[PDB]
């Protein structure tokens, strides 16, 4: 995160100041790599 | 008669002409055969390496165990 400590926020509120802050929440990034079941051959054949 | 031409219409011979092609003997059911298995074909194929195997287009319950796919 990048939380910005804004000093006496209440004081500047009394001053009537609009306030912004470059902020980040606790984000996350996940990568899953998933192997693939891939057919290649067959021979014993049966019907039912 | 001969591999190129035989004495029966339902018999076809695939005679190889090169070292990289296979040989096949195919017979077609008919005449005195069952009406259900009429026009079906059973073939004996030979790889150029020298291995023989059998295959057929008849139903599975009519397929012999030695010719099962």
How does this structure look, described?
This is part of a larger assembly, with chains A (48 residues) and B (69 residues). With 48 residues, chain A is mostly loops. In chain A, 12% of the residues lie in helices and 0% in strands. Chain A has one helix spanning 9-14. The N and C termini of chain A lie far apart (61 Å). Chain B is built from no helices and four strands. Chain B is flat and about 40 Å long. The interface between A and B is small, with 3 and 3 residues. Chain B: Disulfide bonds join 54-67. Chain B: The pili are polar flexible filaments of about 5.4 nanometers diameter and 2.5 micrometers average length; they consist of only a single polypeptide chain arranged in a helical configuration of five subunits per turn in the assembled pilus.
Task: Describe the structure using short key phrases.
part of a larger assembly, 2 chains, A: 48 residues, little secondary structure, 12% helix, 0% strand, B: 69 residues, virus, Acinetobacter
**Shape verdict of chain B:** flat
- Bin the helical content of chain B: under 10%
> What pattern of helices and strands is seen along the backbone of chain A?
H
Largest interface between protein chains, with number of residues from each side:
A-B, 3 and 3 residues
Strand content of chain A: under 5%
Q: What distance lies between the first and last C-alpha atoms of chain A, to the nearest angstrom?
A: 61 Å
Q: Helix and strand string of chain B, N-terminal first?
A: EEEE
Task: Assign an overall shape of chain A.
Answer: rod-shaped
Q: Specify Rg of chain A, calculated over alpha carbons.
A: 29 Å
Q: Count of helical segments of chain B?
A: 0
Oligomer: part of a larger assembly
PDB class: virus
Keywords: Acinetobacter, SsRNA phage virus, T4P, virus
Entry title: Outer Mat-T4P complex
Chain A: Maturation protein
